[PDB]
Design a protein around this ligand. Sequence first.
Ligand SMILES: [Zn+2]
Ligand SMILES: [Zn+2]
Length: 96
Amino acid sequence: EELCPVCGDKVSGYHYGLLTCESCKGFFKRTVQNNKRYTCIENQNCQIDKTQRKRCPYCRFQKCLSVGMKLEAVRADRMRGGRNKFGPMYKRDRAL
DNA sequence: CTAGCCTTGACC
DNA sequence: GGTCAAGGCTAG
Ligand SMILES: [Zn+2]
Ligand SMILES: [Zn+2]
């Protein structure tokens, strides 16, 4: 589906385990790269959509985890390019 | 911090 | 050599 499972924005490709928008790709990568830790200021279940996703990073990252984005696809040694161990996992979603 | 566009590079 | 998901860069 053309819709980001985190926020509903236009999907730009497989990112970190599944189809996501460009923004949720960037956000997940920044968070995991730098071990960022956020605070929800309401009740830890804010609605995430294209126009609210900036408002609560905590609940945005919670939802990234929840829909299945993978911490392991973020690379510790920051190598660019090539293909990770999910390259073949992306094969069977392109069949489903 | 955000998010669009750019560059890399192992796999095929 | 081409693909396309990694990481990189930078206005705003
Ligand atoms: Zn998204
Ligand atoms: Zn929240």
